[PDB]
Coordinates of C-alpha atoms in Angstrom, one line a residue:
Chain Q
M1 CA 12.9 -21.5 6.2
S2 CA 15.7 -21.3 3.6
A3 CA 15.0 -24.9 2.7
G4 CA 11.4 -24.7 1.7
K5 CA 10.0 -25.0 -1.9
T6 CA 8.1 -21.9 -3.0
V7 CA 4.4 -21.7 -3.5
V8 CA 2.7 -18.8 -5.1
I9 CA -1.0 -18.6 -4.0
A10 CA -3.6 -16.4 -5.6
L11 CA -6.5 -15.9 -3.1
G12 CA -9.9 -15.4 -4.5
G13 CA -13.0 -13.3 -3.8
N14 CA -14.1 -15.3 -0.9
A15 CA -10.9 -14.9 1.0
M16 CA -12.6 -11.6 1.5
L17 CA -16.2 -11.5 0.1
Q18 CA -18.6 -14.4 0.3
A19 CA -21.6 -14.7 -2.0
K20 CA -23.5 -11.4 -1.7
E21 CA -22.1 -10.2 1.6
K22 CA -22.0 -6.5 1.9
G23 CA -18.5 -5.0 1.8
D24 CA -18.2 -3.3 5.2
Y25 CA -14.8 -3.5 6.8
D26 CA -15.5 -6.1 9.6
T27 CA -17.1 -8.5 7.3
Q28 CA -14.1 -8.6 5.0
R29 CA -11.7 -8.7 8.0
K30 CA -13.3 -11.9 9.4
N31 CA -13.0 -13.5 6.0
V32 CA -9.4 -12.5 5.7
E33 CA -8.6 -14.0 9.2
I34 CA -10.2 -17.3 8.1
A35 CA -8.0 -17.3 4.9
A36 CA -4.9 -16.4 7.0
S37 CA -5.4 -19.5 9.2
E38 CA -5.4 -21.7 6.2
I39 CA -2.4 -20.0 4.7
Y40 CA -0.5 -20.3 8.0
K41 CA -0.6 -24.1 7.7
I42 CA 1.4 -23.9 4.5
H43 CA 4.0 -21.7 6.2
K44 CA 4.2 -24.1 9.1
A45 CA 4.6 -27.1 6.7
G46 CA 7.7 -25.2 5.7
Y47 CA 7.0 -23.8 2.2
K48 CA 8.0 -20.2 1.3
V49 CA 4.8 -18.4 0.4
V50 CA 4.0 -15.6 -2.0
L51 CA 0.4 -14.5 -1.6
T52 CA -1.7 -12.6 -4.2
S53 CA -5.4 -11.8 -4.3
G54 CA -8.2 -10.4 -6.5
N55 CA -9.4 -6.9 -5.9
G56 CA -12.7 -7.0 -7.9
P57 CA -15.2 -5.8 -5.3
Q58 CA -12.7 -3.7 -3.4
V59 CA -11.4 -1.6 -6.4
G60 CA -15.1 -1.3 -7.5
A61 CA -16.4 0.2 -4.3
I62 CA -13.4 2.6 -4.3
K63 CA -14.0 3.7 -7.9
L64 CA -17.7 3.9 -7.0
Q65 CA -16.7 6.2 -4.1
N66 CA -14.5 8.4 -6.3
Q67 CA -17.5 8.8 -8.7
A68 CA -20.1 9.5 -6.0
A69 CA -18.0 12.1 -4.3
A70 CA -16.7 13.9 -7.3
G71 CA -18.5 17.2 -6.5
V72 CA -16.9 17.1 -3.1
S73 CA -13.4 15.7 -3.6
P74 CA -11.3 15.2 -6.7
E75 CA -12.1 11.8 -8.4
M76 CA -9.2 9.5 -8.8
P77 CA -8.5 7.5 -12.0
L78 CA -8.9 3.8 -12.1
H79 CA -5.2 2.9 -11.6
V80 CA -5.1 5.0 -8.5
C81 CA -8.2 3.3 -7.2
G82 CA -6.2 0.0 -7.8
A83 CA -3.4 1.4 -5.7
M84 CA -5.7 2.2 -2.9
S85 CA -7.3 -1.2 -2.9
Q86 CA -3.7 -2.7 -2.6
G87 CA -3.2 -0.7 0.5
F88 CA -6.5 -1.8 2.0
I89 CA -6.4 -5.4 0.9
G90 CA -2.6 -5.6 1.7
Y91 CA -3.3 -4.1 5.1
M92 CA -6.0 -6.7 6.0
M93 CA -3.8 -9.6 4.8
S94 CA -0.5 -8.5 6.4
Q95 CA -2.2 -7.9 9.7
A96 CA -4.1 -11.2 9.8
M97 CA -1.0 -13.1 9.0
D98 CA 0.9 -11.2 11.7
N99 CA -1.8 -12.3 14.1
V100 CA -1.9 -15.9 13.2
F101 CA 1.9 -15.9 13.4
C102 CA 1.8 -14.4 16.9
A103 CA -1.1 -16.7 18.1
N104 CA 1.2 -19.7 17.3
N105 CA 4.1 -17.8 19.1
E106 CA 6.0 -17.2 15.9
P107 CA 7.8 -13.9 15.3
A108 CA 5.9 -11.9 12.6
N109 CA 7.7 -12.0 9.2
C110 CA 5.2 -10.8 6.6
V111 CA 4.9 -7.7 4.4
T112 CA 2.7 -6.3 1.7
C113 CA 4.4 -4.8 -1.3
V114 CA 2.6 -2.2 -3.5
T115 CA 2.8 -3.6 -7.0
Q116 CA 2.8 -2.3 -10.6
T117 CA 2.2 -4.5 -13.6
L118 CA 3.1 -3.3 -17.1
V119 CA 0.4 -3.8 -19.8
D120 CA 0.0 -2.9 -23.5
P121 CA -1.9 0.4 -23.8
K122 CA -3.5 -0.4 -27.2
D123 CA -4.6 -3.9 -26.1
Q124 CA -8.1 -4.6 -27.4
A125 CA -9.3 -4.6 -23.8
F126 CA -9.4 -0.8 -23.7
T127 CA -12.2 -0.5 -26.3
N128 CA -14.2 -3.4 -24.8
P129 CA -14.1 -3.5 -21.0
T130 CA -15.0 -7.0 -19.8
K131 CA -13.8 -7.3 -16.2
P132 CA -16.6 -7.1 -13.6
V133 CA -15.9 -5.0 -10.5
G134 CA -17.9 -3.7 -7.5
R135 CA -21.0 -5.2 -6.0
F136 CA -24.0 -6.8 -7.8
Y137 CA -27.0 -4.9 -9.0
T138 CA -30.3 -6.1 -10.7
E139 CA -30.9 -5.3 -14.3
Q140 CA -33.5 -2.9 -13.0
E141 CA -30.8 -1.1 -11.1
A142 CA -28.2 -1.8 -13.8
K143 CA -30.3 -0.1 -16.6
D144 CA -30.8 3.0 -14.4
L145 CA -27.0 3.2 -13.8
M146 CA -26.3 3.3 -17.5
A147 CA -29.2 5.6 -18.3
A148 CA -27.9 7.6 -15.3
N149 CA -24.2 7.4 -16.2
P150 CA -23.8 6.5 -19.9
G151 CA -20.0 6.1 -19.8
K152 CA -20.5 3.2 -17.4
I153 CA -21.4 -0.4 -18.5
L154 CA -22.9 -3.3 -16.5
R155 CA -23.1 -6.9 -17.6
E156 CA -24.5 -10.3 -16.3
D157 CA -21.9 -12.0 -14.1
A158 CA -22.8 -15.7 -14.0
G159 CA -26.3 -15.4 -12.6
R160 CA -25.3 -13.3 -9.5
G161 CA -26.7 -10.0 -11.0
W162 CA -25.2 -7.1 -13.0
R163 CA -21.8 -5.5 -12.6
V164 CA -19.8 -2.6 -13.8
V165 CA -17.2 -3.6 -16.3
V166 CA -13.6 -2.4 -16.9
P167 CA -10.8 -3.0 -19.5
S168 CA -8.7 -6.0 -18.6
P169 CA -5.5 -6.3 -20.8
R170 CA -2.9 -9.1 -20.4
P171 CA -0.1 -8.6 -17.7
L172 CA 3.4 -8.3 -19.2
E173 CA 5.8 -7.6 -16.4
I174 CA 5.7 -7.3 -12.6
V175 CA 7.9 -4.2 -12.0
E176 CA 8.6 -5.2 -8.4
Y177 CA 9.9 -8.6 -9.5
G178 CA 13.5 -8.2 -8.2
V179 CA 12.3 -7.0 -4.8
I180 CA 9.7 -9.8 -4.4
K181 CA 12.5 -12.3 -5.1
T182 CA 14.9 -10.6 -2.7
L183 CA 12.2 -11.0 0.0
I184 CA 11.4 -14.6 -0.6
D185 CA 15.1 -15.4 -0.9
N186 CA 15.1 -13.8 2.6
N187 CA 12.4 -16.0 3.9
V188 CA 9.8 -13.2 4.2
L189 CA 6.2 -14.2 3.5
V190 CA 5.4 -11.6 0.8
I191 CA 1.9 -10.3 0.0
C192 CA 1.9 -8.5 -3.5
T193 CA 0.2 -8.1 -6.8
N194 CA -3.1 -7.6 -5.0
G195 CA -5.8 -7.3 -7.7
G196 CA -3.3 -8.3 -10.4
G197 CA -1.0 -5.3 -9.9
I198 CA -1.6 -1.6 -10.6
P199 CA -2.0 -1.5 -14.4
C200 CA 0.7 0.6 -16.0
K201 CA 2.3 1.2 -19.4
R202 CA 6.0 1.8 -20.1
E203 CA 6.7 4.4 -22.8
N204 CA 10.0 6.3 -23.4
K205 CA 11.3 4.7 -20.2
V206 CA 8.3 6.4 -18.4
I207 CA 6.1 4.1 -16.4
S208 CA 2.7 5.8 -16.1
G209 CA -0.6 4.3 -14.9
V210 CA -3.5 3.2 -17.2
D211 CA -7.2 2.7 -16.4
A212 CA -7.8 -1.1 -16.3
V213 CA -7.9 -4.1 -13.9
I214 CA -5.9 -7.1 -14.7
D215 CA -6.9 -10.7 -14.3
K216 CA -5.5 -11.8 -10.9
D217 CA -4.7 -15.3 -12.1
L218 CA -2.9 -14.3 -15.3
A219 CA -0.7 -11.9 -13.2
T220 CA 0.0 -14.5 -10.5
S221 CA 1.0 -17.0 -13.2
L222 CA 3.3 -14.4 -14.6
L223 CA 4.7 -13.7 -11.2
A224 CA 5.1 -17.4 -10.4
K225 CA 7.1 -18.4 -13.5
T226 CA 9.1 -15.1 -13.3
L227 CA 10.1 -16.3 -9.7
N228 CA 10.6 -19.8 -11.1
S229 CA 8.2 -21.1 -8.3
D230 CA 7.8 -24.7 -7.4
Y231 CA 4.0 -24.4 -7.4
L232 CA 1.2 -22.1 -8.6
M233 CA -1.9 -22.5 -6.4
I234 CA -5.2 -20.7 -7.3
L235 CA -7.8 -20.9 -4.6
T236 CA -11.5 -20.9 -4.9
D237 CA -14.5 -22.1 -2.8
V238 CA -14.9 -25.2 -5.0
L239 CA -12.5 -28.1 -4.4
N240 CA -11.9 -28.8 -8.1
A241 CA -12.6 -27.9 -11.8
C242 CA -15.8 -29.6 -13.0
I243 CA -18.0 -29.6 -16.1
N244 CA -21.7 -29.5 -17.1
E245 CA -20.1 -34.7 -14.2
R246 CA -16.3 -34.6 -14.7
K247 CA -14.4 -33.7 -11.6
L248 CA -10.8 -32.9 -12.4
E249 CA -8.2 -34.3 -10.0
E250 CA -4.6 -34.8 -11.1
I251 CA -4.5 -34.4 -14.9
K252 CA -1.6 -34.1 -17.3
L253 CA -0.8 -31.0 -19.3
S254 CA -2.1 -32.5 -22.5
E255 CA -5.5 -33.8 -21.5
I256 CA -6.5 -30.5 -19.9
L257 CA -4.8 -28.8 -22.9
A258 CA -7.3 -30.9 -24.9
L259 CA -10.4 -30.1 -22.7
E260 CA -10.0 -26.3 -23.0
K261 CA -10.1 -26.1 -26.8
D262 CA -13.5 -27.7 -26.5
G263 CA -14.9 -25.0 -24.2
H264 CA -15.4 -27.0 -21.0
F265 CA -14.0 -23.7 -19.7
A266 CA -15.7 -21.2 -22.0
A267 CA -18.7 -21.2 -19.6
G268 CA -17.0 -20.9 -16.2
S269 CA -15.2 -18.2 -14.4
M270 CA -12.7 -21.0 -14.6
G271 CA -11.3 -20.8 -18.1
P272 CA -8.4 -18.3 -17.5
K273 CA -7.9 -19.9 -14.1
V274 CA -7.2 -23.0 -16.2
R275 CA -5.4 -20.8 -18.8
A276 CA -3.1 -19.4 -16.1
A277 CA -2.3 -22.8 -14.6
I278 CA -1.5 -24.3 -18.0
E279 CA 0.9 -21.5 -19.0
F280 CA 2.8 -21.8 -15.8
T281 CA 3.0 -25.6 -16.0
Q282 CA 3.9 -25.3 -19.7
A283 CA 6.6 -22.8 -18.9
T284 CA 8.1 -24.3 -15.8
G285 CA 7.5 -28.0 -15.8
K286 CA 6.1 -27.5 -12.3
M287 CA 2.6 -28.3 -11.0
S288 CA -0.2 -25.9 -10.8
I289 CA -3.1 -26.4 -8.4
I290 CA -6.7 -25.2 -8.4
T291 CA -8.5 -26.0 -5.1
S292 CA -10.6 -24.6 -2.3
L293 CA -9.1 -22.2 0.1
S294 CA -10.2 -24.8 2.6
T295 CA -8.2 -27.8 1.2
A296 CA -5.1 -26.0 0.2
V297 CA -2.6 -28.0 2.3
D298 CA -4.4 -31.3 1.3
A299 CA -3.7 -30.4 -2.3
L300 CA 0.1 -29.6 -1.7
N301 CA 0.4 -33.0 0.0
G302 CA -1.4 -34.5 -3.0
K303 CA -4.5 -35.6 -1.3
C304 CA -7.0 -33.6 -3.4
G305 CA -7.9 -30.7 -5.7
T306 CA -7.2 -30.3 -9.4
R307 CA -3.4 -30.7 -9.9
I308 CA -1.9 -30.2 -13.3
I309 CA 1.5 -31.6 -14.2
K310 CA 4.0 -31.9 -17.0
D311 CA 4.4 -34.7 -19.5
Chain F
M1 CA 24.8 0.3 -2.9
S2 CA 26.2 -2.2 -0.5
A3 CA 28.8 0.0 1.0
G4 CA 26.4 2.9 1.7
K5 CA 25.5 4.5 5.0
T6 CA 21.7 4.6 5.6
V7 CA 19.6 7.7 5.5
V8 CA 16.0 7.8 6.7
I9 CA 14.1 10.8 5.0
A10 CA 10.6 12.0 6.0
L11 CA 9.0 13.9 3.1
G12 CA 6.6 16.7 3.7
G13 CA 3.2 17.9 2.3
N14 CA 5.2 19.6 -0.4
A15 CA 6.4 16.3 -1.8
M16 CA 2.8 16.2 -3.1
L17 CA 1.1 19.6 -2.3
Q18 CA 2.4 23.1 -2.9
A19 CA 0.6 26.4 -2.8
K20 CA -3.2 26.3 -2.0
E21 CA -2.8 23.7 -4.7
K22 CA -5.7 21.5 -5.7
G23 CA -5.5 17.8 -5.0
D24 CA -6.1 16.2 -8.4
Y25 CA -4.0 13.2 -9.3
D26 CA -1.9 14.9 -11.9
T27 CA -1.0 17.9 -9.7
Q28 CA 0.1 15.6 -6.9
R29 CA 2.1 13.2 -9.2
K30 CA 3.9 16.3 -10.7
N31 CA 5.1 17.1 -7.2
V32 CA 6.2 13.6 -6.4
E33 CA 8.2 13.6 -9.6
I34 CA 10.0 16.7 -8.3
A35 CA 10.7 15.1 -4.9
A36 CA 11.9 12.0 -6.6
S37 CA 14.6 14.0 -8.5
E38 CA 16.0 15.3 -5.3
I39 CA 16.0 11.9 -3.7
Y40 CA 17.7 10.3 -6.7
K41 CA 20.7 12.5 -5.9
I42 CA 21.0 11.0 -2.4
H43 CA 20.9 7.4 -3.9
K44 CA 23.4 8.5 -6.5
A45 CA 25.8 9.9 -3.9
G46 CA 25.6 6.2 -2.9
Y47 CA 23.5 6.4 0.3
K48 CA 21.0 3.7 1.3
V49 CA 17.5 5.4 1.5
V50 CA 14.4 4.7 3.4
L51 CA 11.6 7.2 2.4
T52 CA 8.6 8.1 4.5
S53 CA 6.0 10.9 4.2
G54 CA 2.9 12.6 5.6
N55 CA -0.6 11.7 4.5
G56 CA -2.7 14.4 6.1
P57 CA -4.3 16.0 3.0
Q58 CA -4.6 12.6 1.2
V59 CA -6.1 10.6 4.1
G60 CA -8.6 13.3 4.9
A61 CA -9.6 13.4 1.2
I62 CA -10.1 9.7 1.2
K63 CA -12.1 10.0 4.4
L64 CA -14.0 12.8 2.8
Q65 CA -14.9 10.4 0.0
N66 CA -16.1 7.6 2.3
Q67 CA -18.4 10.0 4.2
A68 CA -19.8 11.6 1.0
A69 CA -20.4 8.2 -0.5
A70 CA -21.6 6.4 2.7
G71 CA -25.2 6.0 1.5
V72 CA -24.1 4.2 -1.7
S73 CA -21.0 2.3 -0.5
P74 CA -20.0 1.1 3.0
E75 CA -18.0 3.8 4.7
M76 CA -14.5 2.7 5.7
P77 CA -13.0 3.7 9.1
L78 CA -10.1 6.1 9.4
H79 CA -7.4 3.4 9.9
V80 CA -8.6 1.7 6.7
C81 CA -8.5 5.1 5.0
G82 CA -4.9 5.3 6.2
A83 CA -4.1 2.0 4.5
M84 CA -5.6 3.2 1.2
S85 CA -3.5 6.4 1.4
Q86 CA -0.3 4.4 1.8
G87 CA -1.5 2.5 -1.3
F88 CA -2.0 5.7 -3.2
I89 CA 1.0 7.7 -1.9
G90 CA 3.4 4.7 -2.0
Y91 CA 2.4 4.0 -5.6
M92 CA 3.1 7.5 -6.7
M93 CA 6.4 7.5 -4.9
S94 CA 7.7 4.1 -6.2
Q95 CA 6.6 4.9 -9.8
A96 CA 8.3 8.3 -9.5
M97 CA 11.5 6.7 -8.1
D98 CA 11.3 4.0 -10.7
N99 CA 11.2 6.6 -13.5
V100 CA 14.1 8.7 -12.3
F101 CA 16.2 5.4 -11.9
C102 CA 15.3 4.5 -15.5
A103 CA 15.9 8.0 -16.9
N104 CA 19.4 7.5 -15.5
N105 CA 19.8 4.1 -17.0
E106 CA 19.7 2.6 -13.5
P107 CA 17.4 -0.4 -13.1
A108 CA 14.5 0.0 -10.7
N109 CA 15.2 -1.2 -7.2
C110 CA 12.5 0.3 -5.1
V111 CA 9.3 -0.6 -3.3
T112 CA 6.6 0.6 -0.9
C113 CA 5.7 -1.5 2.0
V114 CA 2.3 -1.2 3.7
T115 CA 3.2 -0.3 7.3
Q116 CA 1.5 -0.7 10.6
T117 CA 2.5 1.3 13.7
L118 CA 1.5 0.3 17.2
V119 CA 0.2 3.0 19.6
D120 CA -1.3 3.1 23.1
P121 CA -5.1 2.8 23.1
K122 CA -5.3 5.0 26.2
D123 CA -3.0 7.6 24.8
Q124 CA -4.6 11.0 25.8
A125 CA -4.7 11.8 22.0
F126 CA -7.9 9.7 21.9
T127 CA -9.6 12.1 24.3
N128 CA -8.2 15.2 22.4
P129 CA -7.9 14.8 18.6
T130 CA -5.4 17.4 17.3
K131 CA -4.1 16.4 13.9
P132 CA -5.5 18.5 11.0
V133 CA -6.3 16.4 7.8
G134 CA -8.0 17.1 4.5
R135 CA -8.9 20.5 2.8
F136 CA -9.3 23.9 4.5
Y137 CA -12.7 25.4 5.4
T138 CA -14.2 28.8 6.4
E139 CA -15.3 29.0 10.0
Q140 CA -18.8 29.0 8.8
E141 CA -18.7 26.1 6.4
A142 CA -17.4 24.2 9.4
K143 CA -20.2 24.7 11.9
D144 CA -22.4 23.8 9.0
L145 CA -21.1 20.3 9.4
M146 CA -20.8 19.4 13.0
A147 CA -24.4 20.2 13.5
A148 CA -24.7 18.1 10.3
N149 CA -21.8 15.8 11.3
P150 CA -22.0 15.2 15.1
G151 CA -18.7 13.9 16.6
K152 CA -16.7 14.9 13.5
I153 CA -14.5 17.7 14.9
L154 CA -13.0 20.7 13.2
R155 CA -10.3 23.2 14.2
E156 CA -8.5 26.4 13.2
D157 CA -5.5 25.1 11.2
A158 CA -3.0 27.9 12.1
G159 CA -4.7 31.1 10.8
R160 CA -5.1 29.6 7.4
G161 CA -8.6 28.2 8.0
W162 CA -10.5 25.3 9.5
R163 CA -9.9 21.5 9.2
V164 CA -11.1 18.2 10.4
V165 CA -9.0 17.0 13.4
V166 CA -8.2 13.5 14.5
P167 CA -6.4 11.7 17.4
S168 CA -2.7 11.7 16.9
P169 CA -1.4 9.2 19.5
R170 CA 2.4 8.7 19.9
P171 CA 4.0 5.9 17.8
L172 CA 5.4 3.0 19.8
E173 CA 6.5 0.3 17.3
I174 CA 6.9 -0.2 13.5
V175 CA 5.4 -3.7 13.0
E176 CA 7.2 -4.2 9.6
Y177 CA 10.7 -3.0 11.1
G178 CA 12.4 -6.4 10.6
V179 CA 11.3 -6.6 7.0
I180 CA 12.2 -3.0 6.3
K181 CA 15.7 -3.7 7.8
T182 CA 16.0 -6.8 5.6
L183 CA 15.2 -4.8 2.5
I184 CA 17.7 -2.1 3.5
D185 CA 20.4 -4.8 4.2
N186 CA 19.8 -5.9 0.6
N187 CA 20.1 -2.4 -0.7
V188 CA 16.5 -1.8 -1.8
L189 CA 15.2 1.8 -1.8
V190 CA 12.3 1.4 0.7
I191 CA 9.3 3.7 0.9
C192 CA 7.2 2.9 4.0
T193 CA 5.5 4.5 7.0
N194 CA 3.7 6.7 4.6
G195 CA 1.5 9.0 6.8
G196 CA 3.3 7.6 9.9
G197 CA 1.9 4.0 9.7
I198 CA -1.6 2.6 9.9
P199 CA -2.4 3.1 13.6
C200 CA -2.9 -0.1 15.5
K201 CA -2.9 -1.4 19.1
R202 CA -1.8 -4.9 20.2
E203 CA -3.8 -6.6 22.9
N204 CA -3.5 -10.2 24.0
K205 CA -1.2 -10.8 21.0
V206 CA -3.9 -9.5 18.5
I207 CA -3.1 -6.3 16.4
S208 CA -6.1 -4.3 15.3
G209 CA -6.5 -0.8 13.9
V210 CA -7.5 2.2 15.9
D211 CA -9.0 5.4 14.4
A212 CA -6.1 7.9 14.3
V213 CA -3.4 9.6 12.2
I214 CA 0.1 9.4 13.8
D215 CA 2.6 12.2 13.5
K216 CA 4.9 11.0 10.6
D217 CA 8.0 12.7 12.0
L218 CA 7.7 10.9 15.3
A219 CA 7.0 7.6 13.5
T220 CA 10.0 8.2 11.2
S221 CA 12.3 9.2 14.1
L222 CA 11.2 5.9 15.8
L223 CA 11.9 3.9 12.6
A224 CA 15.3 5.5 12.1
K225 CA 16.5 4.6 15.6
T226 CA 15.1 1.0 15.5
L227 CA 17.1 0.7 12.2
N228 CA 20.2 2.5 13.9
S229 CA 20.2 4.5 10.7
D230 CA 23.2 6.8 10.1
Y231 CA 21.0 9.8 9.6
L232 CA 17.4 11.0 10.0
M233 CA 16.3 13.7 7.7
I234 CA 13.0 15.6 7.8
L235 CA 12.4 17.6 4.6
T236 CA 10.1 20.6 4.6
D237 CA 9.6 23.9 2.7
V238 CA 12.1 25.8 5.0
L239 CA 15.9 25.4 4.6
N240 CA 16.3 25.5 8.4
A241 CA 14.5 25.4 11.8
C242 CA 14.5 29.0 13.1
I243 CA 14.3 31.0 16.4
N244 CA 12.5 34.2 17.2
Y245 CA 10.5 34.5 14.0
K246 CA 10.2 38.2 13.0
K247 CA 12.5 39.8 15.5
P248 CA 15.8 41.3 14.4
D249 CA 16.8 38.4 16.8
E250 CA 15.4 35.9 14.2
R251 CA 18.2 33.3 14.3
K252 CA 18.8 30.4 11.9
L253 CA 19.5 27.1 13.4
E254 CA 22.4 25.6 11.4
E255 CA 24.8 23.1 13.0
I256 CA 23.7 22.8 16.7
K257 CA 24.5 20.8 19.7
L258 CA 21.9 18.4 21.2
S259 CA 22.1 20.1 24.6
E260 CA 21.4 23.6 23.1
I261 CA 18.5 22.6 20.9
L262 CA 16.8 20.6 23.7
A263 CA 16.9 23.7 26.0
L264 CA 15.5 25.8 23.2
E265 CA 12.7 23.2 22.9
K266 CA 12.1 23.3 26.7
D267 CA 11.8 27.2 26.7
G268 CA 9.1 26.9 24.1
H269 CA 10.9 28.3 21.0
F270 CA 9.2 25.9 18.6
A271 CA 6.0 25.4 20.7
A272 CA 3.4 27.4 18.8
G273 CA 5.0 26.2 15.6
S274 CA 4.9 23.7 12.7
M275 CA 8.5 22.9 13.6
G276 CA 7.6 21.6 17.0
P277 CA 7.2 17.9 16.4
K278 CA 10.1 18.0 13.9
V279 CA 12.5 19.2 16.5
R280 CA 11.2 16.7 19.0
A281 CA 11.6 14.0 16.4
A282 CA 15.3 14.9 15.6
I283 CA 16.2 15.4 19.2
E284 CA 14.8 11.9 20.1
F285 CA 16.8 10.3 17.3
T286 CA 20.0 12.1 18.1
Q287 CA 19.5 11.5 21.9
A288 CA 18.9 7.8 21.4
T289 CA 21.6 7.2 18.9
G290 CA 24.3 9.8 18.9
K291 CA 23.7 10.2 15.2
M292 CA 23.1 13.4 13.2
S293 CA 19.6 14.5 12.5
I294 CA 18.9 17.1 9.9
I295 CA 15.9 19.4 9.2
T296 CA 16.0 20.9 5.8
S297 CA 14.0 21.6 2.7
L298 CA 13.5 19.1 -0.1
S299 CA 15.5 21.3 -2.6
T300 CA 18.8 21.3 -0.5
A301 CA 18.8 17.7 0.9
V302 CA 22.1 16.5 -0.5
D303 CA 23.8 19.8 0.5
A304 CA 22.5 19.2 4.0
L305 CA 23.9 15.7 3.8
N306 CA 27.1 17.1 2.6
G307 CA 27.0 19.5 5.6
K308 CA 26.7 22.7 3.6
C309 CA 23.2 23.8 5.0
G310 CA 20.1 22.9 7.0
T311 CA 19.7 22.4 10.7
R312 CA 22.1 19.7 11.7
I313 CA 21.6 18.4 15.3
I314 CA 24.7 16.7 16.7
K315 CA 25.4 14.9 20.0
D316 CA 27.1 16.3 23.0

């Protein structure tokens, strides 16, 4: 209710895609329903919740489809693809949270907000795309893709295969900030900023879309401190941050500020996750949490996960 | 504006598509920008605004893409395509509204909500798909593709040419209504119900999508009344709903009593007509609420609001 602290939670890939599942609808739906049941617990413990997600595989299938059907229907640019993934991802999430609400005989009170994020158009990211999207290929398939379509680039994504890559500039402003705040002030569980937000530039007072995909964690950090949130929570499948064996539990700003200059996090898909938690904790004095989707409430209660706090 | 009366406006194909126009992104955006200018004037008059739209050409496109790409990427069902189209269309609309707000040194206060609409799974519509979506085809390009595409049904979209046709079951409930009313109470300009809502059924307390495209005027009419909005406004490309097309008896519905338009409906004056569901929709709002419903063209909206034009349906 009106009394709850606010937690901003950035769902990950596996809220939706497990390790090399195929992206059909039902598969993703069952994963979302599993996530929703965990989220619900946080709602029931009485925190206000802002939920975000990645959109990596989902925006990549969509851009793939736009490419493959170009001779048959006009191809949409990458920001429009991002928009369409928000609809789809936002649909799945809003519906499963409505269902878990109703199953527990609570009146549904959840929405998905389409979301734009301003970025810098001449960011270096536009001349070296580095953000993996879509499903995994082999280097065998990857090489034919590039041979086949030489505008497109694949790269190795942490031993899972090869993936198409897109420009990923830093998020500067969530355009729908005011509205998101209005909703949370009003006790709505808000889903927003799916996939980091639709990448846009603002020139001459004109917001127009640009072709990128933003880091979900960097955007949610931005969102969380903009909202002056009580917690930033980034969910994975792994209960903590680890190395090489160091398992990070509660750690102070400084020590983890010290571990990241030494690239404990320049090997993992974990660095900017750490980078996003740090910035938020730095900026707000409030705790950021990186845990598994499965121990989320345990973490809030302080029973587990990597928790980062002020000094 | 906290003092404002609320107006629920359904935008038409022409919000996004004009004349035989191609559906590239830039063309459609251009059209949204034009719609947004007109809308801004209603917000600037000081009215609260909930904006809806169709999604027929855009969801059929998306569905086209999923079918063409099915061998290379998993093909998404129609309700999931509906969701994506809200994403696409709501993004265009919000951005456009944002821009016109900024251009007028007014801070952005606008958002699209993904919207689910409940229907009846047994609704006859499911046995008789009727809603044209996507591009137009020759008769012959069409047969070429129900031999090819068994089950996928096409139909003669009104002496313009052939089109895919899908179940259009009647809307029963806007799942996000409460949130939409909360936004409106807080004076946010809300875009929602784009394409009439993602069609869903609710069974045993579980909501799940069904493969359909709901009439967006029916869904909007339903939303307006659930909101007890002050007006419901359906914007098209014709300044008015009309009677006896091409007689010298061709009359122009201007201000008109509920009783009189109902009877006209009953006698089949709009029946073989694009205005059919639009009149049904305004009737249903006005009959439920006593409030004025308006059928106008995008380019004379405020004048309609100001009572200088358009078909304005008033209670008995």
